Design a protein around this ligand. Structure first.
Ligand SMILES: CC(C)(COP(=O)(O)OP(=O)(O)OC[C@H]1O[C@@H](n2cnc3c(N)ncnc32)[C@H](O)[C@@H]1OP(=O)(O)O)[C@@H](O)C(=O)NCCC(=O)NCCS
Ligand SMILES: *C(=O)CCCCCCCCCCCCC
Ligand SMILES: [Cl-]
Ligand SMILES: [Cl-]
Lengths: 393, 10
């Protein structure tokens, strides 16, 4: 099944995605708007699962249920291209990603074995207001689509997708945004992960990265060495009093991109207020007391699959970085120093927004995984990575 | 969902 490049995606047919309100691969789009109308009748009954499986909405406020979801994902969610590392989203992270303002329990859509109640599938929706070119639309973000390794290739993923679609339709929402490492009809933008080594000794030892064979280990560590403390004047962790100005800075900064979130002040608090081992946000408060810039990154460690009891690969993911007075190059240099100080092994960033202006300069290396962005039921021109201004978890 | 990437090898 899965195609990872648009060349190989052109050489195949999509039994499920051809039935969905998305553009065809290779269709060049010059219009802007829905593929199909809002529905004034929505199917009241859940879609049929294969015999022996049943739907269950996951109440994550139940500690036992949250652990079941953590375990499903820890054992069956996204792996790297070589099946050496698997995302290890923490339970507290999952609460952050899955209970933002406006979350709904019916949108934490699980699949369980009927007889044993074992959790074997999941998909989620959370609400988001999305600015796409000249339109703002209430949408959902879809995330954490996961089918147990023992249930794979049994066409359960289309049922999960149709069911969350139905459950979102019931709430009057008819567009969605989502990302995937695979190519489907039809990316609105294609982004690439880059990686900045922070602890190269460990990255090479777990074979996340490789010694250039013309470089010694000693020389690699000198290459990637960073200052012990950040250089930007007035940098400090975001505090409650910074919520309004962070909201103001973000809103004005995102206007320059073509696919962005539109966050309320309560949403800004949720996504940026620091939570240890989940989300870090630092603001620049200058000599006048004014907050002029901020950087942020989230915590997403990964199981080392070939050595399971060893300490996970600790990765920080660039989130939103807003500059109005500090040069973005300096802000991101301080992001690296802070991630290093907090024990991260690698700092990851996509090539979206203005990130290409600093990636090579700050010694990021290009990754092997593309991140495709998609809209459901919204046909619009595609855009280059540097116009994508949306980062998901 | 998100995707897992690692440094491209020459
Ligand atoms: C992704 C996953 C749920 C797909 O389940 P599967 O058993 O492998 O595939 P199924 O037989 O159930 O269904 C295949 C259909 O789902 C599509 N599909 C596969 N992966 C998809 C994805 N990430 N997102 C959306 N659709 C996807 C396929 O293109 C195919 O549809 P098509 O006929 O139009 O081509 C499953 O492989 C999994 O859990 N992988 C690890 C976690 C993961 O990658 N989650 C998605 C992150 S974007
Ligand atoms: C990562 O986990 C993303 C997996 C995306 C699967 C496709 C989702 C399609 C949109 C479904 C909701 C539609 C709401 C109107
Ligand atoms: Cl919940
Ligand atoms: Cl296009």
């Amino acid at each position: 099944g899965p195609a990872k490049t648009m060349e190989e995606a052109s050489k195949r047919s999509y039994q499920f995605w051809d039935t969905q309100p998305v553009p065809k691969l290779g269709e060049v789009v010059n219009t802007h708007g829905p593929v199909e109308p809002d529905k004034d009748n929505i199917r009241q009954e859940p879609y049929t699962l294969p015999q022996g499986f049943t739907w269950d909405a996951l109440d994550l406020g139940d500690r036992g249920v949250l652990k079941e979801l953590y375990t499903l994902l820890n054992e069956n969610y996204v792996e790297d291209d070589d099946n050496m590392f698997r995302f290890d989203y923490s339970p507290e992270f999952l609460l952050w990603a899955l209970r933002p303002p406006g979350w709904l329990p019916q949108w934490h859509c699980g699949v369980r074995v009927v007889s044993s109640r074992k959790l074997v599938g999941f998909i989620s929706a959370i609400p988001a207001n999305i600015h796409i070119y000249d339109t703002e639309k209430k949408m959902v973000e879809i995330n954490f689509l996961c089918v147990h390794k023992k249930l794979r290739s049994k066409r359960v993923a289309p049922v999960l997708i149709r069911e969350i679609t139905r459950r979102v339709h019931l709430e009057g929402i008819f567009q969605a945004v989502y990302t995937a490492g695979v190519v489907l009809p039809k990316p609105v933008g294609t982004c690439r992960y880059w990686h900045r080594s922070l602890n190269p000794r460990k990255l090479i030892e777990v074979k996340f990265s490789h010694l250039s064979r013309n470089m010694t280990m000693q020389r690699t560590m000198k290459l990637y060495r960073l200052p012990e403390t950040p250089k930007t004047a007035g940098l400090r962790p975001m505090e409650t009093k910074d919520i309004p100005v962070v909201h103001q800075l973000l809103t004005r900064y995102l206007k320059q991109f073509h696919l962005t979130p539109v966050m309320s002040q309560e949403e800004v608090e949720h996504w940026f207020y620091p939570q240890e081992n989940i989300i870090d946000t630092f603001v620049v408060e200058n000599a006048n007391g004014e907050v002029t810039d901020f950087l942020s990154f989230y915590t997403l460690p990964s199981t080392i699959m070939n050595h399971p009891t060893h300490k996970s690969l600790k990765a920080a993911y660039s989130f939103y970085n807003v500059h109005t007075q500090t040069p973005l190059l300096d802000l991101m240099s301080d992001a690296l120093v802070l991630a290093k100080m907090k024990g991260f092994d690698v700092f990851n960033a996509l090539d979206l927004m203005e990130n290409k202006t600093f990636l090579e300069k700050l010694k990021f290396g290009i990754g092997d995984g593309n991140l495709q962005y998609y809209l459901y039921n919204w046909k619009c021109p595609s855009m280059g990575a540097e116009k994508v201004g949306l980062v998901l978890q | 969902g998100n995707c897992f990437s690692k440094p491209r090898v020459p």
